[PDB]
Scaffold this active site. Sequence first.
Site, PDB file in Angstrom:
ATOM      1  N   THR B  11       0.876  -1.183   0.000  1.00 37.79           N
ATOM      2  CA  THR B  11       0.000   0.000   0.000  1.00 37.79           C
ATOM      3  C   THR B  11       0.913   1.233   0.000  1.00 37.79           C
ATOM      4  OG1 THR B  11      -0.106  -0.362   2.421  1.00 37.79           O
ATOM      5  CG2 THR B  11      -2.094  -0.879   1.145  1.00 37.79           C
ATOM      6  N   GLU B  12       0.382   2.325  -0.533  1.00 35.02           N
ATOM      7  CA  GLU B  12       1.087   3.585  -0.566  1.00 35.02           C
ATOM      8  C   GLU B  12       2.450   3.547  -1.246  1.00 35.02           C
ATOM      9  OE1 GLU B  12       0.928   4.023   3.693  1.00 35.02           O
ATOM     10  OE2 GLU B  12      -0.872   5.308   3.542  1.00 35.02           O
ATOM     11  N   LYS B  15       1.193   3.838  -6.824  1.00 35.63           N
ATOM     12  CA  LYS B  15       0.767   3.136  -8.032  1.00 35.63           C
ATOM     13  C   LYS B  15       0.168   4.099  -9.078  1.00 35.63           C
ATOM     14  CE  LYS B  15      -3.027   0.311  -7.404  1.00 35.63           C
ATOM     15  NZ  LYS B  15      -2.969   0.575  -5.948  1.00 35.63           N
ATOM     16  N   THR B  16      -0.683   5.024  -8.663  1.00 36.93           N
ATOM     17  CA  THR B  16      -1.295   5.992  -9.605  1.00 36.93           C
ATOM     18  C   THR B  16      -0.265   6.987 -10.165  1.00 36.93           C
ATOM     19  OG1 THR B  16      -3.320   5.723  -8.403  1.00 36.93           O
ATOM     20  CG2 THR B  16      -3.213   7.603  -9.931  1.00 36.93           C
ATOM     21  N   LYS B  37      -9.411   2.070 -14.620  1.00 34.52           N
ATOM     22  CA  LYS B  37      -9.373   1.595 -13.227  1.00 34.52           C
ATOM     23  C   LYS B  37     -10.780   1.022 -13.033  1.00 34.52           C
ATOM     24  CE  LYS B  37      -8.114   2.622  -8.512  1.00 34.52           C
ATOM     25  NZ  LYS B  37      -6.810   2.006  -8.243  1.00 34.52           N
ATOM     26  N   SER B  41     -12.302   2.186  -4.630  1.00 33.85           N
ATOM     27  CA  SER B  41     -12.966   2.385  -3.335  1.00 33.85           C
ATOM     28  C   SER B  41     -12.416   3.663  -2.754  1.00 33.85           C
ATOM     29  CB  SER B  41     -12.632   1.252  -2.350  1.00 33.85           C
ATOM     30  OG  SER B  41     -13.142   0.003  -2.780  1.00 33.85           O
ATOM     31  N   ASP B  54      -8.036   8.816  -7.955  1.00 32.40           N
ATOM     32  CA  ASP B  54      -7.066   8.072  -8.777  1.00 32.40           C
ATOM     33  C   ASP B  54      -7.627   7.848 -10.162  1.00 32.40           C
ATOM     34  OD1 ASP B  54      -5.243   8.082  -6.691  1.00 32.40           O
ATOM     35  OD2 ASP B  54      -6.030   6.202  -5.882  1.00 32.40           O
ATOM     36  N   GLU B 115      -5.258  -0.161 -14.167  1.00 36.73           N
ATOM     37  CA  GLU B 115      -4.797  -0.054 -12.793  1.00 36.73           C
ATOM     38  C   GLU B 115      -5.699  -0.824 -11.857  1.00 36.73           C
ATOM     39  OE1 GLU B 115      -3.082   3.783 -11.095  1.00 36.73           O
ATOM     40  OE2 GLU B 115      -4.633   3.278  -9.667  1.00 36.73           O
TER      41      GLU B 115
END
Lengths: 224, 224
Positions: B11-12, B15-16, B37, B41, B54, B115
């Site tokens: 996580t974090e 990715k975007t 995408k 969420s 995102d 994504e």
Amino acid sequence: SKRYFVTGTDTEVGKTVASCALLQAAKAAGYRTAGYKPVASGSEKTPEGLRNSDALALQRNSSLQLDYATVNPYTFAEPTSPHIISAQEGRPIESLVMSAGLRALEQQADWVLVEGAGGWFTPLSDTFTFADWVTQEQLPVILVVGVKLGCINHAMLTAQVIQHAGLTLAGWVANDVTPPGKRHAEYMTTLTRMIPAPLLGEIPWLAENPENAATGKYINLALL
Amino acid sequence: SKRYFVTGTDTEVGKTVASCALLQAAKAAGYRTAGYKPVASGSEKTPEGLRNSDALALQRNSSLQLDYATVNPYTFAEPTSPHIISAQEGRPIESLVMSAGLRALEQQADWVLVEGAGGWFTPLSDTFTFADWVTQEQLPVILVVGVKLGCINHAMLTAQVIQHAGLTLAGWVANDVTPPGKRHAEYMTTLTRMIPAPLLGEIPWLAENPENAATGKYINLALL
């Protein structure tokens, strides 16, 4: 004698906390226990050499009286990947030495818990990872899962890789690394369904130093 | 047409940010690009429905003019695992719908970037994960690795699982999620040796909103 390798799904999941709980539970069951952390990085200087706090925890929670070097033969000052400090210091991490220390413990204990450094694929050298050593030792594995953001993916990835290496996933322990949040029950249910091994117990969030807490009550050793 | 699936190791990891850099680089190369995408969420309410930031980034960085629903068919308000909010809301995530949206984009773009949500093994339902969908679509994968604590283990785990599913690991992108630290060069070298795919580039640490930054210069598309 029973022997287990403990690994975590991510950093800061409380791997040592779970290890101490496991050791306390084994001792309550009547086993002669020994904790073993062959490699440890991030250590304090003392008059007798470098000391790692996680190794100290395992030493203290073992039922047998053990010398520090027996619990942790390889100690490095900087808290970085073992293969990096190893190379920098000119001190190779030997598979034979790690294995020897394991046999040494097995001569006194009925129940030995081996705690890795980092995660599954932590490099010990440029051509040898921790996974290579566990695989050759054929140690069953206990997965410590921190109930947090991203745990489902990390636990599934680790579980799949371990099974693929032909090793036994003995069980998993859920460690509550943060205070109660929403979706906690949902995360636990998903993890329970997806990890192909028994849930041994869940260690609640404790704010002090869970390593010093009596946490063995949270583990159901009958499931191992 | 070229099509890629982008996933992160943890996580974090940004990715975007990496996805937008990839899109900018493809556009500079002359491709008619589209970001996709399928599931997102954690979204804001607007007069026209829920909007995910995102997905907005991918929409904005696509060379073609696309409608939001085309970029992100499935939008959920709470930032939790898709299978959890999906069940709560009574809105199943359909493989056929995700696939349809992919075909829809392929009718206009020469280069499509997909994504994912979460990591590799993110559940979409109780019996279907994101990995299942990527595998059936036979999409080559681009791994986004955050250069931080635990990245070596997470990148190796993800890479092994992807190859094992018979998919192609197209490349990886190193995202500097924190300011320069020691061992950065050592981490990059280890990652480069261990990930069995070409390093496409490294996006430096930027403090503002890397999604809005001109980052395409950091990607070497000739390596894809």
